[PDB]
Design a protein around this ligand. Structure first.
Ligand SMILES: O=C(O)[C@@H]1C=CC(=O)N1C[C@@H](O)[C@@H](O)[C@H](O)[C@H](O)CO
Length: 320
């Protein structure tokens, strides 16, 4: 039998399928190493894993607030830049402990069979608008969307008014059917068991490709960066750096954006992409101006406090 030579932790579902097609399988073919994708990535699981000393993840995909909390707790190995060679990825994305490989939007989407006319962020947070709502599982993304739904202009979000954001969620808590992960949200859209959600653009667009009659907008959307990183104690840290080097190249980056509606950080992947793909990405001006970019520094400074309040809030008000 063959034990995985490289275990990569991600978010499952259609996004993990897209990473498998663009990154994992092409790396496995090129290196002759078995690449196995798994789920569960996040600060809590990376922290528990690294501190136990029983590290089974070689590479993680970390969204920027999770990446910040992981760097803060010293849970990651410094990236080997003598191995990771992608000068096409701008300097800001090439950090000490991680390489930003993707830009993704989180958007308001609605079931066209319930809302043929669409829904605005203010309507999502209006109790008079009836529909089964799904929010994200953590406070990240959720709070920014609530504030923009309450009239905070996207450019004015930070520092977040956490008390206000929670009162805004509270207005519609009785119609929220879950605080969920991405794969669970796409499943609810496809089954037609939700009416309005806030989810990654790629998840929404893949649900539509699968036949879900939904639409979405960039109003009140939040953009963020995803990083590749290596947990401290990774059994195959050198293999992990070679995978990261491979994955951040223009061709694998272009393939990812071709399969799912998330953007590359490799500026050279834009040279390889058809111009029409640009209009569905978070950086496209028409899209960017209607929402905001997640402020990783604010989350770095406030995540622990916000997380304790969010966990208390969700434990008290969850009803499904
Ligand atoms: O899996 C996805 O397609 C997207 C794309 C990158 C990413 O971090 N994703 C997950 C987030 O949209 C989101 O589900 C987040 O992990 C949760 O809200 C918990 O913070």
């Amino acid at each position: 039998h063959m034990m995985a030579d490289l275990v990569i932790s991600s978010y499952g579902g259609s996004f993990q399928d897209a990473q498998t097609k663009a990154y994992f399988d092409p790396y496995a073919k090129a290196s002759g190493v078995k690449v196995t994708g798994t789920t569960g990535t996040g600060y809590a699981k990376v922290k528990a894993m690294v501190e136990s000393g029983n590290v089974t993840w070689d590479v993680i995909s970390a969204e920027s607030p999770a990446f910040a909390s992981e760097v803060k707790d010293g849970l990651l190995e410094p990236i080997d830049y003598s191995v990771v060679k992608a000068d096409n990825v701008p300097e800001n994305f090439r950090t000490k402990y991680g390489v930003g490989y993707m830009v993704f939007g989180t958007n308001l989407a609605w079931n066209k069979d319930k809302f043929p006319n669409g829904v605005t962020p203010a309507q999502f947070f209006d109790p008079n608008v009836k529909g089964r709502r799904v929010l994200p599982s953590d406070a990240t993304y959720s709070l920014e969307f609530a504030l923009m739904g309450d009239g905070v202009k996207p450019a004015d979000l930070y520092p977040l008014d956490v008390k206000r954001a929670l009162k805004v969620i509270d207005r519609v808590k009785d119609q929220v059917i879950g605080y969920k992960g991405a794969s669970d949200i796409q499943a609810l859209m496809q089954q037609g068991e939700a009416d309005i959600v806030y989810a990654g653009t790629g998840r929404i667009k893949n649900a539509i490709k699968a036949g879900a009659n939904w639409s979405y907008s960039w109003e009140g959307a939040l953009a963020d960066t995803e990083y590749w990183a290596v947990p401290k104690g990774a059994p195959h840290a050198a293999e992990a750096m070679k995978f990261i080097n491979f994955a951040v190249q223009a061709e694998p980056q272009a393939e990812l954006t071709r399969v799912i509606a998330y953007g590359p950080t490799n500026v050279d992947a834009l040279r390889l992409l058809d111009p029409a793909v640009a209009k569905d990405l978070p950086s496209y001006p028409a899209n960017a101006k209607l929402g905001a970019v997640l402020n990783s520094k604010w989350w770095n400074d406030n995540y622990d406090a916000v997380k304790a309040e969010w966990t208390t809030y969700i434990m008290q008000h969850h009803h499904h």
